[PDB]
Amino acid sequence: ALPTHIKAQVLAEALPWLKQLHGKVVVVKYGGNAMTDDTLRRAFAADMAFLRNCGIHPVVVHGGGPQITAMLRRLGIEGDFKGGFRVTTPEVLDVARMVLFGQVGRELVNLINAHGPYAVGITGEDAQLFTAVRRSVTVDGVATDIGLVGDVDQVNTAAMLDLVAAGRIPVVSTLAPDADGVVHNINADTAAAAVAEALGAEKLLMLTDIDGLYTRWPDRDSLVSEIDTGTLAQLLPTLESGMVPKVEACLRAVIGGVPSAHIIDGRVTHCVLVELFTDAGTGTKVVRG
Amino acid sequence: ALPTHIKAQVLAEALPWLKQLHGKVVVVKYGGNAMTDDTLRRAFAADMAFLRNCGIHPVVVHGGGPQITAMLRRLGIEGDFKGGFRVTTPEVLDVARMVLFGQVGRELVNLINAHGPYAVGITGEDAQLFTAVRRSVTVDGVATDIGLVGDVDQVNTAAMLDLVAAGRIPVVSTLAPDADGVVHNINADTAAAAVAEALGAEKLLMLTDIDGLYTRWPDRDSLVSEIDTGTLAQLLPTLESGMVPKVEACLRAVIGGVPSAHIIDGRVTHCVLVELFTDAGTGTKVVRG
Amino acid sequence: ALPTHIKAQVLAEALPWLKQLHGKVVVVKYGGNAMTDDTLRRAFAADMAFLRNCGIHPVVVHGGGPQITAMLRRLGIEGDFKGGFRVTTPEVLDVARMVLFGQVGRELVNLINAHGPYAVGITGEDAQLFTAVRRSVTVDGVATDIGLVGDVDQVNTAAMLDLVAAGRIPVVSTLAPDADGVVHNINADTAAAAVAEALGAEKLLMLTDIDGLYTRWPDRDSLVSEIDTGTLAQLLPTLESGMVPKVEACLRAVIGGVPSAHIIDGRVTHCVLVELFTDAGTGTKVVRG
Amino acid sequence: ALPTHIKAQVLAEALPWLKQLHGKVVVVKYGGNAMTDDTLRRAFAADMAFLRNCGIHPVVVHGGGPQITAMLRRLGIEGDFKGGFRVTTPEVLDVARMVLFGQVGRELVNLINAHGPYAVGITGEDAQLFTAVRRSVTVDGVATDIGLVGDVDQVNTAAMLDLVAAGRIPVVSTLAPDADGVVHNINADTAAAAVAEALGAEKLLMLTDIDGLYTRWPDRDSLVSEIDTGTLAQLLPTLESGMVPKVEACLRAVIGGVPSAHIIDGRVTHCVLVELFTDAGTGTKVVRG
Amino acid sequence: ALPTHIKAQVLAEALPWLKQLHGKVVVVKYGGNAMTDDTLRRAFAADMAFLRNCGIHPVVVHGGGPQITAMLRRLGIEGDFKGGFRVTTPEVLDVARMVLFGQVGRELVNLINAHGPYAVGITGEDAQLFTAVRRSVTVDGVATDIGLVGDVDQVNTAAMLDLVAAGRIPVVSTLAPDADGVVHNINADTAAAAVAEALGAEKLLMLTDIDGLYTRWPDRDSLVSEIDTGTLAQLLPTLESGMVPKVEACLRAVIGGVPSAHIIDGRVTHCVLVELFTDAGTGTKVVRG
Amino acid sequence: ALPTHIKAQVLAEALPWLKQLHGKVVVVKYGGNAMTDDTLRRAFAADMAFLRNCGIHPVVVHGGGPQITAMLRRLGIEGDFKGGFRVTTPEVLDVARMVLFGQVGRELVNLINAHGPYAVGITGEDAQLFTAVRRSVTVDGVATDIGLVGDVDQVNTAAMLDLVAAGRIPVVSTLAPDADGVVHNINADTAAAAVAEALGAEKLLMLTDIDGLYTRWPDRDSLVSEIDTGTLAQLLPTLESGMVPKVEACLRAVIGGVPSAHIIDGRVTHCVLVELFTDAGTGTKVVRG
Numbered sequence A, B, C, D, E, F: 001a002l003p004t005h006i007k008a009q010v011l012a013e014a015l016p017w018l019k020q021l022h023g024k025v026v027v028v029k030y031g032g033n034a035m036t037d038d039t040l041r042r043a044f045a046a047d048m049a050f051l052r053n054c055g056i057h058p059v060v061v062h063g064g065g066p067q068i069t070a071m072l073r074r075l076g077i078e079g080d081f082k083g084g085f086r087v088t089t090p091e092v093l094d095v096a097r098m099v100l101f102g103q104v105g106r107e108l109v110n111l112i113n114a115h116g117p118y119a120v121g122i123t124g125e126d127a128q129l130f131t132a133v134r135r136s137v138t139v140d141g142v143a144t145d146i147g148l149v150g151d152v153d154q155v156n157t158a159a160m161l162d163l164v165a166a167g168r169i170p171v172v173s174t175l176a177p178d179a180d181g182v183v184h185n186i187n188a189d190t191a192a193a194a195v196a197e198a199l200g201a202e203k204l205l206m207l208t209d210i211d212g213l214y215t216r217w218p219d220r221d222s223l224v225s226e227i228d229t230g231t232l233a234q235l236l237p238t239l240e241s242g243m244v245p246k247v248e249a250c251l252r253a254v255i256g257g258v259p260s261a262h263i264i265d266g267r268v269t270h271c272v273l274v275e276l277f278t279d280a281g282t283g284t285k286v287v288r289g
């Protein structure tokens, strides 16, 4: 029952964003509900097909922490924990890789591919597309080893951009070999920001389960729609557990040269379309300042 | 004040049409009000930039009958008329070409180019892009010569598609040489359909000053949103003066292989966006049947 | 302690085979011991790097039946069996895909990649590279359904050959969607022959755990080094359980246009090099006749 | 009745100039008689086809001052004059553009195209090929505004050279938008020199209605066949009204890097061929010194 | 002392021939005086540079009968003769190849290369560019073997056209292997016609030591400037010893699809330029009829 | 009678060298016995086909001193000698060029081409592929002129690499023009090293008639399998007449950037294969140090 002139206004408003994005890379960190509820996940897959059919170049990075825990429990693999961290033994790494690449990534490739021959699954292992470096975590303020977990080290930017030039949507499971060929599991938020910077992405989108960034949670009036890196970096020691990784990734990407990073509400159906192609978006847009 | 979920629905509905149009040619016959009121004309130019920034390949064909008459009166060139037709003397042809290519086309190239280096003006004279063949008209049921007017004869499909592959939007003024190099003026509606067929266009759009096709004017309930060629060809001897050329062009194009032709309401702001990227459109869609 | 002139003779003997294979596809069915003992598996990976560094285009197809059974037992998933066949429920399919693509294929990609950025893992799901069609099996001479198992239906030959032209070695896990997007598990021997035919491969190699084809097992003197399709098809109803699938795949590939198919001894270190680059080989070579 | 050995000598003498010009751009300023008498104009068009069929890349820049005045008088548009200059109102600009691009350029495109699909008409408006900057003129030694007239500001060298690489002969009407999109009329002599410098032309040719450059008009013995920029710049304050713009353009182009500039006698049939492919030429050749 | 307007007429007359030849192959049989007198040979080399610098694609085929005889006498190699034919022993073949490719061809490559990096020497041996088939000759009306002499059998048209596309002028010495790799000497006139047909040449030029074709030698009034294949084939049994091979080659080439073949006066300086770029030429032009 | 596992070991040992050489240039100086005994020469030709069919890019440089002397004696051309050097008169140069390019090079092109359309003969004259500069020699410690002999001056690296990219094996006869077009004969050892450096070759191979480099001839225990440039340059004033040119060429090439140079035993059948694809080789390998 929607009037024609309203349809026209919504469509026309996409023009400056289509201009900005045409022929550019967009890295999208996929996770949370958008990946659990069927309506949200089918809409997310459709939105990747949408970007491809505008001449835009999406790259999807996904996680799967809860799926990994679920499979480890099904296999009866007792975990060892340091602080809040499971130690990633070689056994845990094999399960993580098999879950992320062999199950979670598979769901997204198939959903996207209902729309066309677009998606292709990859890890850092394939064609040496990226490497990992082992990382410690701080437990009680002391650096602590927790096994085969790492950060992205180097990215085969040319090989990655060749795949995207071939018209493919890479669906990335974040595992990668270190310099000695030992595969590590990389946090998908930190990986998304590293890939965005390495590929020269125009935007980085990170789907979360909240409306946006509250600077003084739980004050409702502290929600912000736009913020620059300087202001944001001052509030990062203030933020709550959950938002800290998403914010750190937005900061590293935009300071690393990505023109804008977006923390968007993955509970909103077609949140990717709303963030990219409306003026208001549906979350918090981060830019340099 | 428009809710996010409504913005999402309008945007998401474009997906099947972006899939269908990506990398395809769309010929758009530009005329009437869309070319006279400033808001409509700036929106039309913006919509050509829109298609280009989705990876779609627009080709604009324009007329300018009233501008030609206006200039002939300013020059004091007395016309000779047979039935309702001005005879196109060599003098009239020179004025028509100078108005269409040197004024009317120039307005559209500049408007479009406010958005980027897209538009390029051309006639059939440039690079022998298409030729004309002289045509008679029927006056009182007898074939009548009215000077240097013609139909499109042959199209340099390769050279045309090369220009479009270069990322340009051709803005076409319909003049063209015959086999002896004598330039003729071609009716812009018939030319648009000839170009659409020659280029293998996915759609032909024809902007008119009415909501759509009324099959039994003035009965309001005879308006139709979709119709096939068989049904439409049976009503063409019934239709009113104004709709006949637009309908004949839709019939020739779709029978000539163009999957769909559209008679759309040029009085609707961003009518091109509404016709292409909504399910309902804003006019009459013609397909084979 | 090997004399120079002997080294020269072995190397020189490779010339006619390098001529025949340069720029050609070779599909290699990887399985059995060559995939279990560490020395054999590292040699197999090195041989894929060898072919790549001669300008040859290897494509590896692998199975993993025993790994799938092992994982199903670890998960406590009770199987239902018809004749000798496990029914592939949707649950069993998910485990099979996660084992084949997320563990077995991963081992080979990494081993190969110790030599360079060559290997890339793929299934039929990625970029719609190939499709599956559901297959029944004969149990007591009646066609029997055993769940989500299939044959290769169609192959995206162009997209596959593009990946190989990019200098990559595809490591193929044989899962693929049917026409409705439902993923099936395909027997890796039948898949290797289908891929070989579809890609226009020069040779198909199938690694087994025996010296070659005995036409009258267990008679030692019935081993053959070369045989044509006509003679071989007459003995297929005679052969033993294990050799039947390998022989059927060789027959379908060579009749399907692949110049030669090879059943080679995967227990021989560097068996791929020996089969391709010596006159005698190390198994049974099948050609049309 | 011309002896064979004389034909051979004339042809052979072209060799060093064909070597120098092969694959190079030549900008030709077309105007005066060469554009008014039918024999001269058909010969000029034939010479553009000649250069194209030697692998040379001509670019034609034309004026049309007298045609513009003629049309303004036919329309009854009263002019306002400052010194010797007509003020270019928005009305005058529209007429100038419609005359230059819609009539004058059209004649040349058609003449050239009698020889092949070579010529294409363009202004700075098309594909943003070049921009204009507003210019004052000195009237009684004080800077004076005379409306929408300008100099070439920037040139889309890549897009221009792409058109020429496509085998086309651009026929340029010198109108162009300023940074705000407002179209200006540019003096065709100054534009030709700007285009020559921007495209890296090997030569700039300027057709005039005199044998060449007389350094002390009217002394017959002051005619010169070659002169360098240093000597020429010293005589520019000495020269007569008519030669000053042609000389200033030759100076700016050759100092701007064009190896040679030529003021040639447009009254000589095939003057372009004579200047380029004989040692003596038919005018004055300017080089750096 | 030649007037400008005469220079213009000679140059302008080349236009239809430059149009016809642009981007086309011209095979030129080089021999006789044009290869002995220094002025003629330097002019011939300059004319090959001329064609290259018009975008034309010359291919030079040369002989060297007298040079071969001279070298055989210097080596004291006694000849055996059947009728008028020297038997080409393996020894004679080695001398012929070393003279033609190692001396005669070398002179032309160097002369041409004074003008640029154009010429490249080749025989049928190089890259298997063409093969030979052994030929008998008729001695007293009986077929007679005279050793390792042959006709062109097959031509590597693609490899030849690749060399010419690279901007090179092949200078061809007519030796070539038979199917068993045994090199034969091929008559350069017959080879030129075979190469012209194989490459799809626009013209074949054959330099001789006479004004043109006299149909009734020695009657001065029997000289002809143009003749078709039908008329010419009727006079071939009439012609004199010397003209027969040149005429047979023109007939085979034009009947084989080459639009025109030319027997031209190699004693005329720059005869190639005169034949190609004047209406009258300097010899006899053969076309189909 | 060679066991399979031995064949496998020899083949597998080639892998690191195929990796190092894939897509790289190898310059091979061909001379001595490898060019005189039929078995050695056919094996050398087969080895050039081998490298080509691994994706390696061989370039063959040959000499022919003894063949030149033999031909000069057959022609009765009295030589003039300064020290041990024949003065290369213009006559001697013509014979040298005709022998090297017209006989010696021809043998190798044909032998190689028994394997495919690979070999192409060239000198510095063809396409100006390289130039020569005149060189004096030291006779009794005073610089002495000995006619038209020279060193390589400059190399058309792009044109050379284009030929090799086309899949051809250049067979180079070392003659080349100086800056004035006068052709000189260049020592083939010095030329091979100059070409290797200019083309960025991975290896330079020089075939000699000895096992390798003896540092204290005739002490059998002074033979060395590997040596660096620093150690080698200290022994060059110690070495014997024959080895000095081969050693000087290895030194200039490796210091000039070629990773390794090899003096190998041309009396060993398939010595090229043994040197490149075994760890031990068959001679002396020189590297920087």
Ligand SMILES: NC(=[NH2+])NCCC[C@H](N)C(=O)O
Binding pocket: A017, A203, A225, A226, A260, A274, A275, A276, A277, A278, A279, A280, A281, A282, A283, A284, A285
């Ligand atoms: N959270 C926001 N305020 N988002 C605004 C997004 C604006 C624009 N669509 C972009 O992609 O940058």
Ligand SMILES: NC(=[NH2+])NCCC[C@H](N)C(=O)O
Binding pocket: B017, B203, B225, B226, B260, B274, B275, B276, B277, B278, B279, B280, B281, B282, B283, B284, B285
């Ligand atoms: N007048 C109509 N019913 N139009 C429907 C248009 C549907 C679709 N957007 C198309 O471009 O074909």
Ligand SMILES: NC(=[NH2+])NCCC[C@H](N)C(=O)O
Binding pocket: C017, C203, C225, C226, C260, C274, C275, C276, C277, C278, C279, C280, C281, C282, C283, C284, C285
């Ligand atoms: N089992 C055999 N007889 N094998 C012979 C193999 C011969 C050759 N290397 C080939 O790849 O075809």
Ligand SMILES: NC(=[NH2+])NCCC[C@H](N)C(=O)O
Binding pocket: D017, D203, D225, D226, D260, D274, D275, D276, D277, D278, D279, D280, D281, D282, D283, D284, D285
């Ligand atoms: N006015 C002259 N002197 N002209 C000489 C021209 C020489 C030569 N054809 C050139 O294009 O540069």
Ligand SMILES: NC(=[NH2+])NCCC[C@H](N)C(=O)O
Binding pocket: E017, E203, E225, E226, E260, E274, E275, E276, E277, E278, E279, E280, E281, E282, E283, E284, E285
């Ligand atoms: N012998 C002759 N009549 N020659 C005329 C040659 C005409 C023209 N130049 C051509 O190349 O075909």
Ligand SMILES: NC(=[NH2+])NCCC[C@H](N)C(=O)O
Binding pocket: F017, F203, F225, F226, F260, F274, F275, F276, F277, F278, F279, F280, F281, F282, F283, F284, F285
């Ligand atoms: N004379 C020697 N030691 N040679 C060793 C050669 C090693 C290796 N095949 C190479 O090409 O470099």
